[PDB]
Amino acid sequence: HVAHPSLGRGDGFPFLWDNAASTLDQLNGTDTTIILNGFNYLDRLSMFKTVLEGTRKYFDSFAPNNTANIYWGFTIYLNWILATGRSADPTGHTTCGLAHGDPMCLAEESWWNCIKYNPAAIAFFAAKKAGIFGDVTKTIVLAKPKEANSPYCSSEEECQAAYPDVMATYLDYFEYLMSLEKTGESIDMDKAQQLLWKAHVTSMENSIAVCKPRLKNYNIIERQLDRDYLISLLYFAATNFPTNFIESIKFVADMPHRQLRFGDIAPFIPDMDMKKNNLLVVLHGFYTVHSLSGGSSLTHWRNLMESPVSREMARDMVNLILAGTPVEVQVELAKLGIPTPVDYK
């Protein structure tokens, strides 16, 4: 049995979904503690699953199997990074994540691991704080990184001190949910999604500089995909596109099913379908606009995205992208009010 990049265990749910904890009580620990290994796939899966189960009651009415839940996004992406080998050690110094080593191990040296750690772990703490799992007396004990002054925080307090904006934004999301018990209001989806994206973006923006050196562990083609993906995410986030199960599967199904290498030129990669080849072109399109505008296109984009009408029009562009419809990013952005930059070097 191996994790499928888009289908997880086979029907979209993550590889080993049933094996992950639904509640804190199913985790390992000692009567006074909870043990979680942040460098293990299953424990990282449980950091997502427990929040998903914990928040299921707010989304249950809308779709079967907690699929309307907007926590799915980075949960589905956990499976994709596993399945494509992107959580493994790219340096050759350990066998962490490799088939002949510990396949569940997530490497410190992995760029994907580096950027996705906080949305699993810090978010978990924030849910704990907000009361999503209930009263928790036991202390959470996280496995420590081997690197000195590592980007990976290993306790609630250390996480909070290292990345205070990331903790505060995920807290705001979970507090908003809890508040729905305190008032009986039905959830405002647009608002819940906007809060969750704000935390996601704050995390990315908090980890871009610290994780950046890990990009050199990959060949130039895979490395530019990483960059293209992170910059693109910031544009997608501003549209408030849903991060539920259906949309997250759609996304991963368009992402490359293996690490890129020298010789891969999108949209002409012959072991990939049209949707994967197109998306790679699109992600690089966002990168190019961003880069040639010196980042100023993202400031303009976020200003324009203060309008709900614009966000809706921008989501229609994202849907076109995910279906594989060829779009030139610069042309679509211009249409939505973004000055097209040109190369001045």
Ligand X SMILES: *[C@@H]1O[C@H](CO)[C@@H](O)[C@H](O)[C@H]1NC(C)=O
Q: Footprint of ligand X on this chain (CB under 6 A)? A: 11, 64-65
The size of the chain, in residues, is 345
CA 49 to chain centroid, in Å, comes to 14
Identify which of residues 64 and 263 has a Cβ nearer to ligand X in the complex. 64
Identity of the residue, 20 or 167, whose beta carbon is nearer to ligand X in the bound complex: 20
**C-beta of residue 230 within 8 angstroms of C-beta of residue 207:** no
For 222, the token pair is 């895979």
228 contacts: CB under 8 Å, gap ≥ 6: 280, 283, 284, 286, 287
Least Cβ distance, residue 61 to ligand X (angstroms) = 13
Q: Which residue sits closest to ligand X, CB atoms considered?
A: 64
To the nearest whole angstrom, how small is the minimum distance from the Cβ of residue 25 to ligand X?
A: 23
- Rounded to whole angstroms, the maximal C-alpha distance in the chain is 63
State the virtual CA torsion across 157, 159, 160, 165 in degrees, nearest 10: 180
Measure the CA–CA gap between 170 and 174, rounded to whole angstroms.
6
- Give min distance, CB of 63 to ligand X, in A: 9
CA–CA separation, 86 and 258 (whole Å): 8
**Nearest residue (CB) to ligand X, 80 versus 112:** 80
> Closest distance between ligand X and the C-beta of residue 274, in Å?
27
Nearer to ligand X, 63 or 274 (CB): 63
* Rounded least distance, CB 278 to ligand X, Å: 28
For residue 186, give the DSSP letter.
P
What are 234's two structure tokens? 């910031």
| Residue 14 or 119 with smaller CB distance to ligand X | 14
The CB-of-78 to ligand X minimum distance in angstroms stands at: 18
Question: Distance (Å, rounded) from C-alpha 150 to C-alpha 139?
Answer: 22
Torsion sign across C-alpha atoms 41, 46, 48, 52: positive
- C-alpha distances out from residue 203 to 126, 185, 337, Å: 13, 29, 27
- Cα dist from 314 to 65, 235, 337, whole Å: 28, 10, 11
The least CB distance from residue 245 to ligand X, in Å, is 10
Give the residue with the Cβ less far from ligand X, 75 or 277: 75
Q: Which is nearer to ligand X, 13 or 111 (CB)?
A: 13
